[PDB]
């Protein structure tokens, strides 16, 4: 409306109701000027890499885009708790966005000193691609989720793309989309934007651990994976970090599998093992980037569909042995485990053909995937000279933008039906003392997520 | 106002013209040097009409 | 900054190239002008706006501008005329700039 | 370990002005202040002032509102205080030091200091 | 409706419905302070005589005025394909115009730094002129357009004009007008701006090649140009370009007739070969303003219509050779071509008689052509005397603006009919890899369009 | 309704009806940044064994909180001596709470002065937990209370809150309650804020 009235109110709850749930959330954000409002053309060249693996050819554009894709933005270590423990399995149904109070401030720099002062005028874009145009990102597990600890004020990470590549060269096939040219809405202070998606109805996720072994049909496909252990004695003392791992390759360029379809980390008991590049593993806080050592990252591992899914150090069976092994007609199988930190969507590639599209990582695999949501600053040109030159304005005022940003979904559940006797397996704290609590800050002031969680907990007969 | 002076004097055209055929007396010197067209020599600018 | 080249070598009764290259940012985009500088007094427009000259420029100054360069035509060298000549544009929003300047040498 | 680091040692003669740098080396940074206390020959110590980290803001001293500078960059993870004015009157050795809460809310000290510095004002070449 | 509210919404966008078609882009301007708020005369002095030809005398205004007159402001490089390949014949109907979002900066100084600070209550005049009592300058293909690229912020040109004189002086049959003599319209840092307009009836542009030649109604007139090689070697060994120059005196002043009636660039099977100021020329990217070298410009070879046009290198004709020929009972001709970054109309002017009034360098003729807007910042004066002055007050903060402007304008088209049962010529990339796809930015960041774009590919029946 | 028209009225009064009163009051706060936007954890270990009794632990949020649960917040000692002299009992029954006229400010130093100046766009969040789901700390007799005399601009007290725990060390039953959790309504220099309870 204006300039003093408050345009939007922080919303963070969870409602829990009935068969459904309700969790909003809610963030401050700052976006900086990136590319110093420029399109830009990127390569492996550009970057250094001379590998031809690593060869890739695309632009980086100022646009910033927002990243709820992960499910800590929207649980709440307890709910994901109250979220697994009592429940038969989920699905998403609606997601509400909105986003309010715009603050733009612009930076001056003095000879040594740089004072912060609001531009009131100045403007803020922002528009969501609900025909799915722009190439779209949030399929690749990328940094840059709105943070897990509401308090926390999080920069909204940059947009850009790869297209196709010979080398670095292009083809002339490769394509370059401007963003400009996709209409969007532009909020000064006292605006705001908000809109609402429908979630196409997918399955739901599965959480449980099948009580009964199948062989007590046939298992589920199998694509083999080296057994690394995490006894580093036991480990064969040679560089088969790269050499080893299975890798699925495409237009001469090597990939590795990461993970594969889902299969069981490792043979029952045997905890020590796990698939070189079968499951994900994640960073533990405050771990660096490069050539970490091994206790900094939490490994998931997949024991629940032991029962179903073959090992992943393991051959499908004899016919000689097989090594990998495609889909029979009465195989039966189930999907890799969401957790708290993973993924919730991805977009199902726009194909003629696909086969059982859910994706490896986890989540729920679509084909209307909810929008990205891209925003950038109305760059301010700074003072032209009195006389006209062609050229375009190199010269712009320093600003960033601040404000609030909130996203509110609908989750469904299926209830436990079972008839089972004797208890569960639940999922909880350690009383056990210790010098900080678990999913909580330290004296330092840092959030730290200790353990991963898995969804499966509650069994079925298979 | 003049037909051949309708343009405006303060900007350029992005218009050309063929400035030089030549860089200087000698043999073999042709060249092609190409150049914009604007407020300072105006009878090479493109005009759309015509007496 | 512009380049230029230091000396320019004479005799009376020739003329001497003088020359400045610049690029697309800044000879490019906008003409060179040529001041003829004589230590001591206020530097003099000799050449403006590429060939076009003020009022007083005696008839022998011819300057004239390439792609990238610009190049300063003296006719009928002098031993009075010889003076440090500076090339001059405008680059960026408006500032103007200055190629480092020739000292021309008459003999 | 918890470290503040002041920089070299200058000699400035009066009238000249004289930054100084203290690196926080081993931890936030930004959430505690940091106090700078001079020592003059024969003198208490006293009180500079402290910048918030964060903040970029200063609280100078009744005796330094005047001549003090306190500016900070967190990039380079140093911050720095700048004596525009020396004088006879101004050598001393200049320390940095930090609040430290000891983790507790209601506590407030300065727990760590700097190796230190010293600057020798005269006008004698 | 107030400073912390947006007034308006960046639209950029193409529809595409039927016989029509959509056109808006949105971009961004920045308007500085010309000639300190006054009205200057202008006039060419130059040499003592030696050049008649380049008199001219006029007035320099504060006014700076929009042109959007050039088409690659309206049409995206992937539509003018869309547009081209399929469509006999195009038109515009409506045009429409909303300029929001206007800020007036303060930049000032502060004891040795530049100071970009906000004036709200600072205004900003605009008007058009519907009633064309100014005189038009959109009419010769000026500098100054609205932006290739939408993410590039550009700069109003100055407006001025001339009149009549006798050598540098001026007559007393000259007009002088002064733009604030207009009812205009303040626009204060909230306020928007609009105005809409209806083209008048112009016949179908013809984008399309003869399928037939006249020789298999007697082609058109002819004025003949020198014909140049861009193969230097060829060419005579001597400076003709003033010579060469195929001219029209009016009033005594000898004016290069360019780019000349309509005619074939050259002969079929000789490609190198170019009229000397036949043919329209363009500029590539970050080309030299003087004598830049042949490859730094790109030369539009009009190839396209000889069958009916008779070339522009050759006589027309025996009876003796006929050098130009005018109309004739039975004469047909084609237009000339219209580019991607040549102008779309111009103004016919005022007269008791005109002929095909078709305007020379392409695009489309009107007599009440789209209205021009004039847009200047209001002075702000310095803070005047105590005792009374009467000289007026030449000390005015320096201010300068900036803002938005868009333009919707509606395009017809007439679609594709043909019976050929080979296939047509159709624009078309390239597939051969490349360090840069064309029409997209490199890694510096600038947008470059690598090569003109003739409208004429289709193929109609003479 | 906007940045130039005030957003509320200063009313303190009170005014004795019959068997009933209503005591209003009305004063200035000001509430800086408390942590620098950081919860932590806080417990006092200053020895291995540190105190038997006088360990604790728990965490220190950023939020201030009101504390008008003293008496004379509400009571000039006049409406007190009036109040003790003529009667028998008394006792609460509603409770009104406005909250209005938020002033913003942003404090940058340039060139060794620092110099505040209004930021008009910032906001301030607050809320009432009306499910009584955070730690009740109004029952402790703190400091922080509203001034007894109307003419004195107070400063508000920081929020944090105390859990279980075994020496300085915590245990899984101790609980971390973020309150950026709950739904606050956001305000700006324009807004206020009322809510009345029984």
């Known amino acids: 409306d204006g300039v003093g009235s408050s345009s939007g109110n922080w919303h963070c709850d969870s409602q829990w109701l009935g068969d459904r749930v309700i969790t909003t959330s809610t963030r401050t954000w700052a976006l900086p000027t990136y590319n110093n409002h420029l399109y830009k053309q990127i390569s492996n060249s550009t970057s250094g890499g001379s590998s031809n693996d690593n060869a890739y050819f695309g632009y980086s554009t100022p646009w910033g885009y927002f990243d709820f894709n992960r499910f800590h933005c929207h649980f709440s270590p307890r709910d994901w708790q109250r979220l697994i423990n009592n429940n038969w399995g989920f699905r998403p149904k609606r997601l509400n966005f909105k986003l309010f109070n715009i603050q733009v401030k612009e930076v001056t720099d003095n000879n040594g000193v740089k004072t912060i002062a609001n531009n009131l005028t100045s403007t803020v874009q922002v528009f969501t691609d609900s025909d799915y145009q722009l190439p779209y990102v949030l399929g690749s597990a990328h940094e840059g989720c709105l943070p897990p600890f509401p308090a926390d004020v999080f920069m909204i990470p940059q947009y850009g793309y790869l297209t196709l590549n010979d080398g670095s060269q292009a083809v002339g096939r490769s394509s370059f989309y401007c963003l400009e040219y996709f209409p969007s809405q532009m909020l000064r202070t006292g605006n705001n934007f908000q809109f609402s998606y429908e979630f196409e109805n997918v399955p739901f996720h599965s959480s449980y651990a099948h009580s009964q072994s199948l062989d007590r049909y046939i298992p589920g496909p199998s694509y083999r994976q080296q057994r690394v252990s995490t006894t580093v004695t036991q480990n064969n003392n040679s560089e088969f970090a790269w050499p080893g791992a299975s890798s699925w390759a495409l237009n001469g360029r090597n990939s590795l599998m990461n993970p594969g379809p889902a299969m069981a980390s490792h043979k029952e008991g045997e905890d020590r093992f796990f698939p070189l590049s079968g499951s994900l593993i994640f960073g533990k806080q405050g771990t660096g980037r490069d050539n970490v050592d091994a206790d900094k990252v939490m490994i998931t591992n997949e024991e629940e569909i032991k029962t179903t899914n073959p090992v992943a150090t393991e051959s499908y069976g004899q016919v000689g042995w097989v090594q990998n092994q495609g889909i029979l007609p009465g195989m039966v199988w189930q999907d890799r485990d969401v957790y708290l930190q993973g993924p919730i969507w991805a977009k199902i590639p726009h194909t003629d053909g696909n086969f059982h599209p859910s994706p490896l990582m986890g989540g729920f695999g679509m084909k209307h995937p909810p929008p990205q949501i891209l925003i950038k600053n109305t760059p301010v040109p700074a003072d032209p000279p009195t006389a006209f030159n062609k050229d375009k304005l190199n010269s712009f005022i320093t600003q960033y933008s601040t404000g609030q940003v909130s996203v509110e979904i609908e989750w469904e559940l299926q209830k436990e039906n079972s008839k089972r006797w004797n208890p569960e397996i639940q999922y909880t704290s350690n009383y056990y003392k210790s010098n900080n609590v678990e999913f909580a800050v330290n004296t330092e002031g840092v959030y730290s997520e200790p353990r991963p969680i898995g969804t499966r907990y509650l069994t079925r007969n298979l | 106002q003049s037909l051949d002076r309708l343009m405006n004097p303060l900007i350029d055209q992005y218009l050309y013209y063929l400035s030089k055929t030549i860089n200087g007396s000698g043999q073999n010197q042709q060249t092609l040097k190409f150049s914009v067209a604007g407020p300072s020599n105006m009878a090479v600018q493109g005009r759309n009409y015509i007496p | 900054v512009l380049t230029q080249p230091p000396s320019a070598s004479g005799t009376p009764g020739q003329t001497v190239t003088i020359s400045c290259s610049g690029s697309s940012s800044n000879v490019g985009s906008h003409s060179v002008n040529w001041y003829q500088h004589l230590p001591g007094t206020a530097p003099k427009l000799l050449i403006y706006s590429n060939h076009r000259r003020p009022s007083g420029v005696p008839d022998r100054f011819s300057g004239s501008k390439s792609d990238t360069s610009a190049s300063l035509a003296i006719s009928g060298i002098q031993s009075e005329d010889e003076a440090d000549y500076y090339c001059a544009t405008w680059d960026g929003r408006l500032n103007v700039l200055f190629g480092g300047g020739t000292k021309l040498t008459v003999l | 370990q918890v470290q503040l680091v002041e920089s070299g040692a200058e000699v400035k003669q009066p009238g000249a002005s004289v930054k100084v740098s203290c690196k926080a080396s081993?931890?936030?940074?930004?959430?505690?202040?940091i106090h700078w206390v001079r020592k003059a020959p024969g003198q208490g110590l006293e009180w500079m002032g402290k910048i918030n980290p964060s903040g970029g803001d200063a609280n100078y001293a009744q005796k330094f509102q005047g001549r003090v500078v306190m500016t900070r960059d967190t990039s380079t993870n140093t911050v720095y205080v700048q004596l525009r004015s020396l004088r006879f009157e101004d050598t001393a050795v200049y320390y940095c030091?930090?609040?430290?809460?000891?983790?507790?809310?209601?506590?407030?000290?300065?727990?760590?200091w700097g190796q230190g510095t010293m600057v020798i004002v005269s006008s004698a070449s | 409706d107030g400073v912390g509210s947006s007034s308006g919404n960046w639209h950029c966008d193409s529809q595409w419905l039927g016989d029509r078609v959509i056109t808006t882009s949105t971009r961004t301007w920045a308007l500085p302070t010309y000639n300190n708020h006054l009205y200057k005369q202008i006039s060419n002095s130059t040499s003592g005589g030696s050049s008649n030809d380049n008199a001219y005398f006029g007035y320099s205004t504060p006014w700076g005025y929009f042109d959007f007159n050039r088409f690659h402001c309206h049409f995206s490089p992937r539509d003018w394909q869309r547009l081209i390949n399929n469509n006999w014949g195009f038109r515009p109907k409506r045009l429409n115009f909303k300029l929001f979002n206007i800020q007036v900066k303060e930049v000032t100084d502060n004891n040795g730094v530049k100071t970009i600070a906000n004036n709200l209550t600072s205004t900003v005049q605009v008007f058009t002129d519907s009633d064309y009592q100014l005189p038009y300058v959109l009419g010769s293909a000026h500098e100054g357009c609205l932006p290739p690229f939408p993410a590039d912020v550009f700069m109003i040109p100055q407006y001025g004009y001339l009149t009549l004189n006798d050598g540098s002086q001026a007559v007393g049959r000259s007009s002088f007008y002064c733009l604030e003599y207009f009812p205009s319209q303040m626009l204060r840092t909230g306020n928007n701006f609009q105005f809409s307009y209806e083209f008048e009836n112009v016949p179908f542009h013809s984008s399309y090649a003869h399928s037939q030649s006249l020789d298999r109604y007697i082609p058109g007139p002819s004025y003949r140009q020198q014909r140049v090689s861009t193969t230097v070697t060829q060419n005579n060994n001597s400076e003709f370009a003033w010579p060469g120059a195929s001219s029209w005196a009016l009033n005594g002043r000898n004016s290069l007739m360019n780019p000349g009636p309509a005619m074939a660039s050259h002969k079929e099977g000789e490609d190198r070969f170019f009229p000397l100021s036949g043919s329209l020329i363009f500029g590539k990217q970050g080309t030299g303003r003087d004598n830049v070298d042949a490859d730094k410009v790109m030369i539009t070879n009009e190839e396209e219509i000889k069958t009916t046009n008779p070339v522009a290198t050759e006589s027309y004709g025996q009876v003796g050779w006929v050098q130009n020929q005018g109309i004739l009972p039975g004469m047909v001709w084609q237009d000339r071509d219209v580019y991607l970054q040549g102008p779309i109309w111009a103004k016919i002017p005022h007269t008791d008689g005109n002929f095909h009034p078709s305007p020379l360098m392409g695009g489309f003729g009107m007599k009440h052509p789209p209205p021009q807007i004039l847009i200047k910042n209001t002075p702000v004066p310095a803070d005047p005397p105590t005792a009374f002055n009467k000289d007026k007050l030449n000390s005015f903060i320096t201010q300068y603006s900036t803002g938005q402007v868009s333009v919707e304008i509606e395009w017809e088209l007439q679609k594709e009919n043909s019976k050929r049962w080979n296939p047509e010529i159709q624009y078309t990339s390239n597939y051969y890899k490349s360090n840069n796809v064309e029409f997209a930015v490199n890694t510096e960041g600038v947008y470059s369009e690598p090569r003109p774009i003739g409208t004429r590919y289709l193929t109609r029946n003479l | 309704d906007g940045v130039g028209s005030s957003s509320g009225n200063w009313h303190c009064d009170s005014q004795w009806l019959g068997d009933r009163v209503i005591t209003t009051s009305t004063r200035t706060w000001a509430l800086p940044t408390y942590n620098n936007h950081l919860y932590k954890q806080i417990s006092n270990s200053t020895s291995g064994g540190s105190s038997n009794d006088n360990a604790y632990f728990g965490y220190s949020t950023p939020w201030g909180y009101f504390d008008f649960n003293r008496f004379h917040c509400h009571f000039s000692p006049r409406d007190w001596q009036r109040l003790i002299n003529n009667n028998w009992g008394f006792r609460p029954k509603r409770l009104n709470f406005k909250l209005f006229n938020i002033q913003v400010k942003e404090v940058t130093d340039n060139n060794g002065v620092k110099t505040i100046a209004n930021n008009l766009t910032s906001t301030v969040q607050v809320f009432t937990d009306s499910d009584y789901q955070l730690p009740y700390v109004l029952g402790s007799a703190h400091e922080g209370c509203l001034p007894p005399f109307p003419a004195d601009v107070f400063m508000i007290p920081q929020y944090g809150y105390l859990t279980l725990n075994d020496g300085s060390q915590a245990v899984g039953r101790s609980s971390f309650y973020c309150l950026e959790y709950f739904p606050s309504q956001m305000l700006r220099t324009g807004n206020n804020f009322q809510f009345s309870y029984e």
């Open positions: 030091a930090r609040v430290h809460d000891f983790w507790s809310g209601y506590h407030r000290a300065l727990d760590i």
């Open positions: 081993g931890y936030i940074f930004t959430s505690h202040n």
